[PDB]
Amino acid sequence: SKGEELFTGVVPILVELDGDVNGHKFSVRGEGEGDATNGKLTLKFICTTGKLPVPWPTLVTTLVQCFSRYPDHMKRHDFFKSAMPEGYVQERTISFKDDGTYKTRAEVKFEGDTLVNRIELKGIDFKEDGNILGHKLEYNSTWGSPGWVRLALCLTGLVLSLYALHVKAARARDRDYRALCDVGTAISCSRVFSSRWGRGFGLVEHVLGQDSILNQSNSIFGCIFYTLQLLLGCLRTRWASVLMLLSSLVSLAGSVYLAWILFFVLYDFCIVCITTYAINVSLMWLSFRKVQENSHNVYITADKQKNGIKANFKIRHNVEDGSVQLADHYQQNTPIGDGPVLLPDNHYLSTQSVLSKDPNEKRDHMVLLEFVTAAGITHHH
Numbered sequence: 209s210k211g212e213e214l215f216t217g218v219v220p221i222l223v224e225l226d227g228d229v230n231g232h233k234f235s236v237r238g239e240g241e242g243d244a245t246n247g248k249l250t251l252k253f254i255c256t257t258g259k260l261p262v263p264w265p266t267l268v269t270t271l272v273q274c275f276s277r278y279p280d281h282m283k284r285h286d287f288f289k290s291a292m293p294e295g296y297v298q299e300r301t302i303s304f305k306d307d308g309t310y311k312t313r314a315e316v317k318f319e320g321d322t323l324v325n326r327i328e329l330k331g332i333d334f335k336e337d338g339n340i341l342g343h344k345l346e347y348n349s350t351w352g353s354p355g356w357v358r359l360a361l362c363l364t365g366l367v368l369s370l371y372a373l374h375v376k377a378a379r380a381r382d383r384d385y386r387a388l389c390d391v392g393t394a395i396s397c398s399r400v401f402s403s404r405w406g407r408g409f410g411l412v413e414h415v416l417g418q419d420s421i422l423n424q425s426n427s428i429f430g431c432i433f434y435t436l437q438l439l440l441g442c443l444r445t446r447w448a449s450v451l452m453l454l455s456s457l458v459s460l461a462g463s464v465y466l467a468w469i470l471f472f473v474l475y476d477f478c479i480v481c482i483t484t485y486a487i488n489v490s491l492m493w494l495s496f497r498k499v500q501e502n503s504h505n506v507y508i509t510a511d512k513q514k515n516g517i518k519a520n521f522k523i524r525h526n527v528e529d530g531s532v533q534l535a536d537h538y539q540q541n542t543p544i545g546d547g548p549v550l551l552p553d554n555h556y557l558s559t560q561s562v563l564s565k566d567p568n569e570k571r572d573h574m575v576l577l578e579f580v581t582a583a584g585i586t587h588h589h
């Protein structure tokens with residue numbers, strides 16, 4: 209692969225898109241540099257026709273995977289580089305969920321010493337009021353809407369915790385108290401909250417002492433927790449997502465311990481408790497999803513009958529009301545010229561993107577930094 213020998217060092221990249229979406233025609237141009245040795249791209253794109261009719265984040269993937277870092281156990285699998293300098297044809301079908309579709313065809317090749325990506329894109333079936341043409345996606349804000357589902361979960365969790373607080377304080381003060389969540393003799397609410405295990409989870413007093421600041425009614429940790437999850441769900445930084453996930457894992461372990469008490473130790477059926485548990489599971493799942501948005505995995509499999517590759521993956525774009533927009537990608541790559549090519553075993557490219565804005569750019573632009581490194585190929589016994 210003399211091709212891969214083309215990508216030591218820092219190559220100049222040019223990119224040119226001509227696109228038509230639901231009839232609105234537009235042209236994008238981008239210039240930058242590529243470092244296949246660190247898998248790092250830096251690029252600035254400007255729309256040359258005026259107002260871009262779609263959101264910038266939906267054109268990132270259409271807008272040079274030959275700049276990926278292929279590690280040493282994987283050199284025999286880098287198709288993109290091994291097609292150079294003749295280049296390759298990359299074809300994508302990008303389906304947006306409950307919305308339209310992009311069809312793209314690009315040629316990627318060396319022109320002089322410049323890696324050139326030339327794209328024709330055609331989008332159909334878009335709703336002019338949907339997420340795409342309505343410009344309802346997020347670009348890169350620090351703060352954002354928590355979304356309706358996160359809000360339902362956290363407010364319900366908080367209200368239930370404040371109720372359990374009130375209920376604890378009342379059986380403390382009258383042993384004969386019953387609350388709405390006490391029902392006959394099957395479903396119990398008060399004997400649970402006022403047991404050993406309803407303060408500091410029944411653990412603090414043995415580990416830190418009864419005086420501890422941490423020997424609180426469980427519902428105090430509850431209130432703290434649901435408040436936190438709301439707040440962080442309003443943040444869009446990577447560390448916000450890390451905290452969310454780790455606090456959720458704590459909540460999950462606490463739920464399993466408390467349920468092991470509820471059954472098996474106290475023998476009560478507490479509906480408020482089980483609801484708390486379901487909420488914490490939902491939050492944990494959303495925690496997983498939030499955290500997995502920092503890196504996208506492009507799944508590359510070989511396509512021998514066409515002498516190239518095919519690719520599969522999903523993008524989730526943050527929508528301004530707190531939701532997420534799915535973008536299914538199907539991809540084909542076929543060499544332009546001849547000569548041997550490298551047909552890889554199944555593997556993937558791990559991709560991470562950072563969008564930003566030149567404060568000095570009057571035109572409709574996108575500054576894009578990108579890190580891509582390959583993984584997947586199993587190792588040598």
Ligand SMILES: O=C1c2ccccc2C(=O)C1c1ccccc1
Nearest residue numbers: 372405406426427466469470481
């Ligand atoms: O899950 C819970 C549990 C299980 C066994 C023994 C005690 C308890 C609680 O304190 C209770 C709880 C506390 C606050 C909000 C919701 C639920």
